[PDB]
Amino acid sequence: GKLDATLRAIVHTAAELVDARYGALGVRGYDHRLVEFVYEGIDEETRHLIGSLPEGRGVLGALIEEPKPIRLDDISRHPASVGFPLHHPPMRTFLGVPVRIRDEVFGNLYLTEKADGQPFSDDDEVLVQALAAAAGIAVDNARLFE
């Protein structure tokens, strides 16, 4: 539509910008279930194989509690990592930022598997922060929340 289409554009744009194989952005509602879930790097066939949508339970729920960008050379190092459900493709390098405006958080933007086992840089972080802010404006524009 308009939000979905802009969210998809951001995820695609961020992955390209930071040169990541995969990207997602989830936006969650009042019940903490997703309203918007947009992902890059995986076709519809593997998507259906993965099955359930994420619960945002580990590193990603660290991202929503904190407001902090999370930038990791290996996500399994992080205390709150829970690992991946079967068929989900393996990923180690992780760059995730919150999607936000004012003191409101809507969800997150996250990228994995930077080309060759290269770590994400701070350059990369600032770009993903710029795009996650563009995503905050887009959600706030669409309204969606009280």
List binding-site positions for heme: 88
**Residue 74 contacts residue 67 (beta carbons within 8 Å):** no
Q: Does 120 bind ligand HEM (CB under 6 A)?
A: no
Half-sphere exposure of 90 (CA within 13 A, CB side): 2
Residue 74 interacts with, from ligand HEM, its own copies, none (CB under 5-8 Å by kind): none
Q: Does 32 bind ligand HEM (CB under 6 A)?
A: no
Q: Does 98 bind ligand HEM (CB under 6 A)?
A: no
Q: Does 53 bind ligand HEM (CB under 6 A)?
A: yes
Helical H segments across 3-146, by residue range: 3-18, 44-50, 59-65, 122-141
Cα 5 from chain centre: 16
Minimum distance of ligand HEM from residue 96's CB (angstroms): 7
Distance CA 115, CA 101 (A): 30
Q: Could you tell me which residues come within 8 angstroms of residue 95 by beta carbon, excluding any fewer than 6 positions away?
A: 18, 20, 69, 70, 71, 72, 110, 111, 112, 114, 120, 124, 125, 128
Instruction: Output 42 or 101, the one with its CB closest to its own copies.
Output: 101
Size of interface with ligand HEM, in residues (CB under 6 A): 30
Q: Does 115 bind ligand HEM (CB under 6 A)?
A: no
Residue 24 interacts with, from ligand HEM, its own copies, none (CB under 5-8 Å by kind): ligand HEM
Stretch that binds ligand HEM, among 80-88, 99-107, 116-124, 130-138 (CB under 6 A): 80-88
**Residue 36 contacts residue 5 (beta carbons within 8 Å):** no
Residues paired with residue 27 on neighbouring β-strands, in sequence order: 36, 107
Where on the chain is the footprint of ligand HEM (CB under 6 A)?
Answer: 22-24, 39-42, 47, 50, 52-60, 75, 80-85, 88, 91, 94, 110, 112
